[PDB]
């Protein structure tokens with residue numbers, strides 16, 4: 025570590041701590057930036073050499089965090105919690121946590137290399153028949169193929185190709201991650217992740233939330249299973265059993281909007297899937313981003329800077345380069361460079377993703393002048409909710425009409441049901457999955473789930489919550505959790521469950537602030553500068569203040585609350601409930617053991 029990056033001398037009182045924090049900040053931007061840059065160079069161009077460079081950058085980051093971490097502990101570890109500047113408390117709090125910097129040198133290297141190798145495995149995995157990539161090839165098949173056998177080949181091929189080789193590395197990563205964070209005072213890595221929400225009752229609170237949301241999920245599930253039964257027959261669909269995991273339009277069955285055309289209750293109404301219109305109008309990735317950008321500026325939030333357009337990767341490279349296609353938003357910590365890396369496809373659901381990612385960027389733009397340690401969301405769920413809130417307005421038939429993607433719908437009860445169903449397939453279907461992923465990972469981190477039970481416990485949770493079953497037999501050679509991006513890429517997941525609840529709280533508060541007075545689900549906050557000012561306040565706060573306070577200022581409540589979500593969906597909730605009772609549906613999957621047979625002569 026260069027002497028210019030070393031911590032100097034500071035007094036052991038609150039005054040000296042302010043100077044310490046300032047000095048940290050003065051050096052941290054350079055170190056964080058070199059690391060984000062190397063990560064970028066790798067993720068947009070996966071090679072052995074770029075991985076080597078990224079790891080080298082990661083090592084320097086760890087060295088810097090060690091030097092300043094230890095100095096913070098030495099000087100302030102007792103007294104810092106009693107400092108009366110809450111922002112300073114948060115900075116010191118952040119700096120004293122070394123994470124992987126706690127590992128001895130050889131283990132830091134092992135850890136850094138594991139991250140590289142798991143990332144490589146997931147993002148370069150292919151299914152050969154030459155060979156299909158996840159994005160766009162297998163994504164497209166799962167989205168639009170209605171051949172049972174073809175869907176199965178894609179689902180099984182993907183889970184096999186991505187999951188199996190990840191398992192040994194993931195075991196090694198879990199052990200090292202735990203060793204690292206134990207030194208920071210946490211029982212395991214999961215405990216560290218959960219600490220970001222600063223709630224002694226976090227897990228209970230999520231459980232209570234889910235209890236309220238579950239009946240909506242059960243009704244949607246029963247309704248969709250009925251349609252699937254009509255399409256695929258009694259051989260492949262059990263009306264009292266879990267749904268085969270490959271039939272819901274999505275590799276992870278995490279969102280079901282791609283099977284909308286199968287379940288659209290009133291087809292004679294205008295087609296709410298505007299994809300073919302985007303295609304006919306010649307929309308490209310770049311136009312999707314401009315359209316998203318303009319919504320932000322309509323709220324008097326920030327446009328994307330030139331560095332964003334010049335630096336971002338908005339399409340899958342045509343040069344055959346290997347990239348991490350999974351959409352992400354990047355803060356380079358230099359207050360100038362902000363980027364999105366997305367293998368953008370021209371679809372309606374991709375348009376929503378563009379908004380999601382740009383929500384992240386907008387947060388970055390708004391809090392770029394805070395000290396580095398405070399450049400985070402009020403909690404990670406806040407960061408995930410921003411773009412989704414705007415996307416709720418964009419999805420409304422009225423907004424789609426405003427932007428030339430839809431002919432004015434008859435504002436009647438049946439148009440409402442269509443729309444709320446399409447939204448339910450996207451938002452309600454996700455809830456059990458958003459909830460279960462970190463439950464699996466928390467179990468792994470605590471040792472409750474050893475490698476010998478990785479798949480057993482994954483499918484337990486997948487069945488328990490989503491009511492799905494694998495369409496082919498799985499065993500512990502398979503590592504099906506590994507075939508979902510966030511696991512090998514070590515990105516926490518509970519943020520999304522939190523987000524999916526919170527975004528409806530945001531939507532309600534912003535719509536009220538916008539002076540809108542109709543039904544919640546028909547709200548469009550486009551061009552509300554009052555709604556923009558309210559959202560801006562949240563964004564500029566970063567992690568400077570307790571999330572409960574920031575939420576109170578915004579929404580009038582200091583807690584996550586399912587009621588705004590329920591109010592938004594109430595009409596389709598009622599309707600689905602009636603369709604299910606009239607069809608004599610069983611709510612749930614009491615034949616919990618059931619799996620479908622193989623298609624004739626597979627493969």
Ligand SMILES: *[C@@H]1O[C@H](CO)[C@@H](O[C@@H]2O[C@H](CO)[C@@H](O[C@@H]3O[C@H](CO)[C@@H](O)[C@H](O)[C@@H]3O)[C@H](O)[C@H]2NC(C)=O)[C@H](O)[C@H]1NC(C)=O
Pocket residue numbers: 422435541542543546
């Ligand atoms: C589509 O049609 C629905 C009717 O099914 C319209 O919803 C209605 O919108 C009006 C006007 O915003 C609402 O009246 C308002 O009531 C509040 C008090 O509740 C009052 O403070 C306001 O002054 C205003 O008069 C009405 O509540 C609402 N009706 C229902 C049943 O929700 C909707 O406006 C139409 N949407 C579009 C986009 O054209």
Ligand SMILES: *[C@@H]1O[C@H](CO)[C@@H](O[C@@H]2O[C@H](CO)[C@@H](O)[C@H](O)[C@H]2NC(C)=O)[C@H](O)[C@H]1NC(C)=O
Pocket residue numbers: 069071072073074345
């Ligand atoms: C992808 O990454 C590789 C490195 O793994 C890049 O290859 C280097 O490019 C520089 C600058 O043009 C050359 O001078 C070097 O000879 C290359 N270095 C090595 C170690 O091979 C490559 O340019 C990157 N591709 C793209 C499209 O950015």
Ligand SMILES: *[C@@H]1O[C@H](CO[C@@H]2O[C@@H](C)[C@@H](O)[C@@H](O)[C@@H]2O)[C@@H](O)[C@H](O)[C@H]1NC(C)=O
Pocket residue numbers: 496497498499500501502
């Ligand atoms: C786990 O299963 C592996 C392959 O699965 C088998 O073949 C597929 C196509 C299905 O028909 C399935 O029922 C079969 O089990 C086996 O190669 C492997 O031996 C199994 N691993 C262990 C550790 O038992």
Ligand code: PRO
Pocket residue numbers: 380520
């Ligand atoms: O794709 C995923 O898994 C998460 C959830 C929605 C946004 N990104």
Ligand SMILES: [Cl-]
Pocket residue numbers: 217220404405516517518519
């Ligand atoms: Cl999180």
Ligand SMILES: [Zn+2]
Pocket residue numbers: 380381384407408
């Ligand atoms: Zn996100």
